Symmetry: C5
Amino acid sequence: EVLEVKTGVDSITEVECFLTPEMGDPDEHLRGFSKSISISDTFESDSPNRDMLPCYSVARIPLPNLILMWEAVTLKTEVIGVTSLMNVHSNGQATHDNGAGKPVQGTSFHFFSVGGEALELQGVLFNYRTKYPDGTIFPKNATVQSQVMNTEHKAYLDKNKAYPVECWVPDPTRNENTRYFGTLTGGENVPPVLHITNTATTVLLDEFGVGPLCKGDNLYLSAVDVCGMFTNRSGSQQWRGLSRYFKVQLRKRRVK
Amino acid sequence: VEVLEVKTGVDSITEVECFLTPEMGDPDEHLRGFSKSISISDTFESDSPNRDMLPCYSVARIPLPNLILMWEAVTLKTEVIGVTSLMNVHSNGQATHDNGAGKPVQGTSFHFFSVGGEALELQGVLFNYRTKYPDGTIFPKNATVQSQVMNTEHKAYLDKNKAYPVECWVPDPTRNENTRYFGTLTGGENVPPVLHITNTATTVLLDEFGVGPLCKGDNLYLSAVDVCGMFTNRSGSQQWRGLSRYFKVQLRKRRVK
Amino acid sequence: VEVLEVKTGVDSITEVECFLTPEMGDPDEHLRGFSKSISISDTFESDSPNRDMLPCYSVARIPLPNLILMWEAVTLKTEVIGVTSLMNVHSNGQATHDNGAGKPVQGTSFHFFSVGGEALELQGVLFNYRTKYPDGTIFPKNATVQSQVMNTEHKAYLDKNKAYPVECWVPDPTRNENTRYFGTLTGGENVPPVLHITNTATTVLLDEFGVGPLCKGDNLYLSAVDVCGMFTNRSGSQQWRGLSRYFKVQLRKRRVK
Amino acid sequence: VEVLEVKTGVDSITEVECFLTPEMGDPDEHLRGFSKSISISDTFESDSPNRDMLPCYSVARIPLPNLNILMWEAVTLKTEVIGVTSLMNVHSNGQATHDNGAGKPVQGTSFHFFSVGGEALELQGVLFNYRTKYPDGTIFPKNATVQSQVMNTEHKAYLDKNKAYPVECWVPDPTRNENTRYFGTLTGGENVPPVLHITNTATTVLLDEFGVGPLCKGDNLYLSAVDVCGMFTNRSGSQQWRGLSRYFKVQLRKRRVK
Amino acid sequence: EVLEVKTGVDSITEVECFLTPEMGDPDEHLRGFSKSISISDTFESDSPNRDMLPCYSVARIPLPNLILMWEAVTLKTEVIGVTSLMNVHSNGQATHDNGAGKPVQGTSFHFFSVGGEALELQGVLFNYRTKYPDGTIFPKNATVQSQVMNTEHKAYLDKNKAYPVECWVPDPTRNENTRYFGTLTGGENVPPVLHITNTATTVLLDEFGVGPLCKGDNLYLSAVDVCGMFTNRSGSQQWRGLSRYFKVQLRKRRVK
Ligand SMILES: CC(=O)N[C@H]1[C@H](O[C@@H]2[C@H](O[C@]3(C(=O)O)C[C@H](O)[C@@H](NC(C)=O)[C@H]([C@H](O)[C@H](O)CO)O3)[C@@H](O)[C@H](O[C@H]3[C@H](O)[C@@H](O)[C@H](O)O[C@@H]3CO)O[C@@H]2CO)O[C@H](CO)[C@H](O)[C@@H]1O
Ligand SMILES: CC(=O)N[C@H]1[C@H](O[C@@H]2[C@H](O[C@]3(C(=O)O)C[C@H](O)[C@@H](NC(C)=O)[C@H]([C@H](O)[C@H](O)CO)O3)[C@@H](O)[C@H](O[C@H]3[C@H](O)[C@@H](O)[C@H](O)O[C@@H]3CO)O[C@@H]2CO)O[C@H](CO)[C@H](O)[C@@H]1O
Ligand SMILES: CC(=O)N[C@H]1[C@H](O[C@@H]2[C@H](O[C@]3(C(=O)O)C[C@H](O)[C@@H](NC(C)=O)[C@H]([C@H](O)[C@H](O)CO)O3)[C@@H](O)[C@H](O[C@H]3[C@H](O)[C@@H](O)[C@H](O)O[C@@H]3CO)O[C@@H]2CO)O[C@H](CO)[C@H](O)[C@@H]1O
Ligand SMILES: [K+]
Ligand SMILES: [K+]
């Protein structure tokens, strides 16, 4: 039972923050990057290393202590540091003799969500015989059915650099108290197209005029921004990610 | 059917929520969601695809609470489930270049869904009328050369799962008054998958007179195809890859004469 | 014609529903919907395409119930039929790479459709004015070098099937006041077909005064081209591939003076 | 000009309908609508294009019915590229895309542009290379300096002559052109696919934010266009710009001014 | 406190100008171009020369002297000289035997902002061990966190030919008194798509009907228009940039 919005200057608040990407971080110098990608010798023997697997990012932001609950109404968001992908001089692979370095490009996933509780995930596997590595949280008791839909694979995005992007998507059968948005663009030569502006707002209210309601006075923000792959001079390839800005406006709502 | 007023009251609305799994061919016990690798006939007349090489339409007939009243489908939420699985570029695929990652799934895609109060109605069109379609599939019969453009003999109902090959059949635009259907074919061998997910998008199913699909016999028919492209193995062989599709439909009771 | 009021009543509306088959050249009895394989001339002056290598505009003149009143075309639903046929990549096609699937139909496409109350009016434009067009086609006559940009002598009516080559003719934008036309040329050898289907989309045919095409002599004219791209067989030779188009047009009776 | 009321009555409106042919270079008597094959200089400083290799802006000055204070005001535009299907000729001395394949279609860099004004389009010069030597018979930025590569305000002109103003040297001057409406798109890159739409159902409104269209001085309407569709590649691999004509239909009304 | 707009003939003014691009200008003939791009031998040794680094452009425009403040209400903007990119004959690299020169293409960044004070920047680095050259203003005290987000890297776009595009982006946590817009399109074969028209206006008012308010009677305009790279006959590549036109309409606003 959602009742009226509380008004007055005291009745609104704002959360502003950035979520850093979690791409694998193969050493102390390579934050924002994965380990170079290797290919298994057989389909059955797919065994990716942990630092080769991008993961979902999540932040739980505490809100002013308040029945009233904070209701998330609007979102401004964007990728931070888009211009960094213009570095084409840092030991990349030349496009042709005497040319500049190939820029970051190829398969991308750009995703963000705002909820009054953890994002709910459903597991789907490209290859059910993939061995996922220690330190990740992955679909357990995988069967061949996991390659299309196995409803045993349910989880909460409740830990950082744990949930690999390739294993998990938002569960469309749940997430009633979250709003999520994502685009996968696959293909080795796909160009990054990244828009920035401080003039665009997303409205988080549902068709009944109600936004995510924050349980325990916590706001859940989640993101993935795999921008593509950086190709080294040797030809080896690493995922490259960027941080995402969130600004969320909230208001006090009475509930029964 | 004269369509009359909508019922109101708590008893008068219901919701259907489910997923349709893809039917890409499943050539062995480990390859659900994939087809057999594609081979090419030496002539048009010798084209004889194996069944497990042919993606088919998916369909589910969903029973509704028993009810003259009929359930009317009013809105749809839908999306492709598992889009991020296509980021697996390390599972014995074909390197894009020396020391590179594996080619991701790409190329010819067909993304399609329908919601109706009866089975989707189909019209057959053949790329090559001399293609010999395999046992266990339901395909256009008595094909002639006119079947390559339009033969009105090829009518059917999407009334069985794992049966109707995608490449032979399309929604019949001369029929389907009681269904709403939506699809996109993006052809070309290097086409990138572009797959959007969100829980904030709704499609309204009402027609221009405010009437949605009316569920004959209290059954709702959901249909889908989501061929996302092809996976390329190290050897260079290629297999179709598909994903499941989520459907959430809202229905209301409607009186008819 | 001064346009006056619309007639009302059950008897005042009618519908046309049909399909137009493509006319790609049909080089033999097995290849309806295809052109002859494409060959290239040695020089501009020796360009000499055979008839079965030239796609042509499709047209149907549909008689309407005999009626001063005139039938007025108000709305259109239209759709390319057989889009999924283009997923046959196993039928004598050139492999994309060693051990890969066959190439899908792709490259240059023209998708076009028109609805009118008289024949579509055409203007001739030639890529190369010295092209010798074949017997059995209707093509710009007395061509000059000016015909490569605009020669106002080249006027015609789309009044016959398998006759007017797509490459020679376009809708005349200086005329066609009693027709609504819509077309897209997408050029390039690797262009991917993007073909959308749905039964939920309507095009309104009314002009800015609220008047649709008015059907002279109680005839409705539908025209189409759907060259989807080229099919490449295993030898590398290429052929245009086209598909049928569905039309459904709603009409009403309009009084004129 | 204080703009006052619009005149009404059967006599108060008129239409202009015409087409502008492209001016691509026309290297011989058989190649109207094409440029000369494109060649490339051996050094940056020695860039020296032939006249017949340079596409130019097209312009028409259209006399309107005599008014005299009343002026013709341009209110709406329908426009269309004429002959889009000609680009389906892939059998006329083209380079085959692969062994036994069809000819490569026209593709690559394009510029599609049109304007409607009550006076000549005003141009600003910008040079890719200020040391480019532009040929006799063209009108081009004079006294070019290195600043001409980004913005040299000396390079002002009117589009007042055909086969004269090379497309690559000139753009509409956004600091002027208040009595003109202009629209254009450059799509660059050697494999760019032409995407050419045609319909007789699309109208562009020419009124500004105050409800005032271009006012035609001396009762003349100015139409300008460029439609470089891409390049045609012949059997030898050499490449020529290909252009097409553009249709204009403009509706005008009588407006009183003080 | 923002109060009423002033009316009357004299209560409005316009600013019209162009900002020239700053791509690096490696010699006296190459305004609008960068130095040819070279690639470091190792990731760690990335050290771009100054004239190889495009920078943000900025102009501070004095307004009629005026509490009342000038409020920016509308913008028209356009890239100037788009057709110059049709020069495919000036010692470029033929796309194939006997073919024309490859046009300007590949990675682009088109960006513009209008503010009543300097654009505020946040630093993000592709490679934190990049040695940025003397004469540029770059993120100082870089750590591996600077590859994703280091909140120490704050600056104002207060100088021309100084702030490298690849190091800096607008700071979404600040910039309340500016409206900014940008698009990064990455990839070496990306085609430039450049539209021009004098019929398009952007409204600069925020959700409360308030545009940027010009402190000290100064209007701040900023831009980047890296259109892509030109490829020379040898294969060497140089960034190519173009000027940007700005027209801004302002009105007088009373504030307390
Ligand atoms: C070419 C090669 O050996 N590749 C190994 C890789 O080895 C590391 C490094 O290679 C590169 C690469 O993959 O090309 C160099 C590149 O600049 C790096 N890029 C970035 C953005 O950091 C990447 C990257 O760090 C990794 O791919 C991340 O996974 O690495 C080699 O040049 C380096 O060679 C050293 C020799 O090992 C050493 O004996 C000799 O004395 O000195 C050279 C130079 O220091 O070794 C690096 C490994 O420590 O390593 C990855 C996974 O770790 C794979 O094994 C590649 O196959
Ligand atoms: C290269 C080849 O022989 N291809 C056959 C295919 O043979 C199977 C397998 O090949 C692959 C492939 O096509 O590259 C390996 C790949 O990882 C698999 N991918 C996935 C996602 O499962 C595919 C896939 O399973 C099939 O293409 C689905 O149709 O298969 C071969 O490497 C394997 O080789 C065996 C030899 O034949 C055998 O002599 C030797 O003793 O052992 C090796 C290793 O097992 O055989 C596989 C099964 O036959 O088979 C398909 C059947 O449609 C086609 O004939 C391909 O042309
Ligand atoms: C091929 C080469 O040496 N490249 C050097 C570059 O040398 C300069 C110039 O090369 C070019 C180039 O291809 O990079 C020619 C090109 O047309 C120029 N393009 C433009 C748009 O100006 C570019 C450009 O100016 C620079 O790349 C900017 O960074 O330069 C050479 O042709 C030229 O060679 C001279 C010899 O030095 C001289 O011994 C010989 O007798 O005469 C020739 C011709 O004058 O030298 C130019 C350097 O002054 O220089 C850049 C560094 O700026 C890099 O080192 C490239 O790798
Ligand atoms: K006319
Ligand atoms: K001005």
